[PDB]
């Protein structure tokens, strides 16, 4: 019997797939790591598990005693919420008001408590509110996705090894959109240990290219372009940073659905656009480029449709 | 290397998971077959593949020559749309207007053409429109999900064998919500060939219990209670039909998210409610009951939020 104990044993071991119809002019092969296949449809299922699991293993939290807290407007909240549901933790998510009603409904479905903050104060306002709730709540614990070593650690332990095994050791390049930088840092570190010649390409928005020496700015690429260097990002592991526009990311996501039957988030569009550009460079002829596709595209299409209506 | 050729090689081989916290009073173990893990988040990915693949293998359709047509307001349209995208088929989906705008946006993302029909005429109106488009379109092909033997065949070839292998041959009962009846017929037939003592439980809404001798009626359980006996359903394979209310289905889906961290469609709630009832019967002590969970719950939460707003 191979019946999973619970939903925590369903995380990771996601497939690689070749891109076939969006790669005209490419001299390298491009494969996508499909984090859309995670139980709650994003890469954040991995760090929702690892950050809660690590705290438990260190005796820092207890189910039905500890209150988990995270300031997050994105998939980290959903990854934490389904694990908190399964393991029986109270979870408080802090985010600015007027953020996707769709994401809020999913958090509430898993029984997460929502604390909405002043939109004018943005993410900083949500971080401050999370710290204030922690201060006044005994046995409370903030996961701290941008600083928590369990974030890159799970990518070193699972994501990287899966890409190495799945590619038969043939991966030459990893292309990864940087949010926390946990994926590129953890998976990248593992891959460079297997083959030190592997090149790691960070992807950031043109509109917030802080790793390239640009100013922090607003952009439509959900999940990447945090506008600062996260504690968990090892910039020294990066071999190049590719800038992709929100427009190019949206167009590439549209072509992935139309031509590959892959419905992916805008950040997957960004990673694909960067990987296709790298695969067109003649010095990469015959190589295998692996792009991380962080999320399924239904969440975005739902979010856009609500934001429009 | 285990890199998939394309998205068609990512279908099936979905996990089984034990239910742990919604099974108080159960003397049998309950496991869920998670079709939410399919690439486009429902069981219909299997029959989208099988119905197009079968037509190709019989030389009935050609990519970039043939126009595929199906009248469908549900997941069958999405399953067909991502396969049509990958394989390069023009696809026309006929459905009543005022149906989920969210589902329509997903179909359009995959490049499906939508033909909306008079809401007053319901599904019958969409079926009539599909036949009229077929008549006037050379090289056109209607999949006919309720009559197409490729529907139950894929469940005989994949779904059933996966449940048998995944359960280590220990499955005693399959609990399956009946839409087309392809899942219970195909998987059920295979399972009864491995162990003829296995019992097959069909699930239908209280509000449209036509297999129980009730009248066809409206109900909120998306994917089941078609209000007729499909051509592909073998009623003689069914050992019992369980009726579940829309209210009980919604409450069970809510508890699966809160207690198991499983965000599932209302029809998964129906299947779970039926399986939990069966597992409480003392004559089932020590047995393994497997419930099919046909879809992920994000589509429903999105649909409800739009229908409400």
Swiss-Prot record, chains A, B:
It is found in: Cytoplasm. One of its GO terms (cellular component) is cytoplasm. CDD domains: CBS_like. Pathway: Amino-acid biosynthesis; L-cysteine biosynthesis; L-cysteine from L-serine: step 2/2. Coiled coil: none annotated. Its EC number is 2.5.1.47, 2.5.1.51, 4.2.1.50, 2.5.1.52. It catalyses: O-acetyl-L-serine + hydrogen sulfide = L-cysteine + acetate; pyrazole + O-acetyl-L-serine = 3-(pyrazol-1-yl)-L-alanine + acetate + H(+); pyrazole + L-serine = 3-(pyrazol-1-yl)-L-alanine + H2O; 3,4-dihydroxypyridine + O-acetyl-L-serine = 3-(3,4-dihydroxypyridin-1-yl)-L-alanine + acetate + H(+). It comes from the Eukaryota. The keyword Lipid biosynthesis does not apply. The modification N6-(pyridoxal phosphate)lysine is found at residue 44. Its cofactor is pyridoxal 5'-phosphate. One of its GO terms (molecular function) is cysteine synthase activity. Keywords: Amino-acid biosynthesis, Cysteine biosynthesis, Cytoplasm, Lyase, Pyridoxal phosphate, Transferase. The keyword Cytoplasm applies. GO terms for biological process: cysteine biosynthetic process from serine. Pyridoxal 5'-phosphate binds at residues 75, 179-183, 267. Homodimer. Belongs to the cysteine synthase/cystathionine beta-synthase family. Produces L-cysteine from O-acetyl-L-serine and hydrogen sulfide. Can also use pyrazole and 3,4-dihydroxypyridine instead of the hydrogen sulfide to produce two plant specific non-protein amino acids beta-pyrazolylalanine and L-mimosine. This is Cysteine synthase. It comes from Citrullus lanatus (Watermelon).
């Amino acid at each position: 019997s191979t019946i999973a104990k619970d939903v925590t044993e369903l995380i990771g071991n996601t497939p690689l797939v070749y891109l076939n119809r969006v790669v005209d002019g490419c001299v390298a092969r491009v494969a996508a790591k499909l984090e859309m296949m995670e139980p709650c449809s994003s890469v954040k299922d991995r760090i929702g598990y690892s950050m809660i699991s690590d705290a438990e293993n260190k005796g820092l939290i207890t189910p039905g005693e500890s209150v988990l807290i995270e300031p997050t407007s994105g998939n980290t909240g959903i990854g934490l919420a389904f694990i908190a549901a399964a393991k029986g933790y109270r979870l408080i998510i802090c985010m600015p008001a007027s953020m996707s009603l769709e994401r809020r409904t999913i958090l509430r479905a898993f029984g997460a408590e929502l604390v909405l903050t002043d939109p004018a104060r943005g993410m900083k306002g949500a971080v401050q509110k999370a710290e204030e709730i922690k201060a006044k709540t005994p046995n409370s614990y903030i996961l701290q996705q941008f600083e928590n070593p369990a974030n890159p650690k799970i990518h070193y332990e699972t994501t990287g090894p899966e890409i190495w095994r799945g590619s038969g050791g043939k991966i030459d390049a990893l292309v990864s959109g940087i949010g926390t930088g946990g994926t590129v840092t953890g998976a990248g570190k593992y891959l460079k240990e297997q083959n030190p010649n592997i090149k790691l390409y960070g992807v950031e928005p043109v509109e917030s290219a802080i790793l390239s020496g640009g100013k922090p700015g607003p952009h439509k690429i959900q999940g990447i372009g945090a506008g600062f260097i996260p504690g968990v990002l090892d910039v020294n592991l990066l071999d190049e940073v590719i800038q992709v526009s929100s427009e190019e990311s949206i167009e590439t996501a549209k072509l992935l659905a139309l031509k590959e039957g892959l419905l992916v988030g805008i950040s997957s569009g960004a990673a694909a656009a960067a990987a296709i550009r790298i695969a067109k460079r003649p010095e990469n002829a015959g190589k295998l480029i692996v792009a991380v596709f962080p999320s399924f595209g239904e969440r975005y299409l739902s979010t856009v449709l609500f934001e429009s209506v």
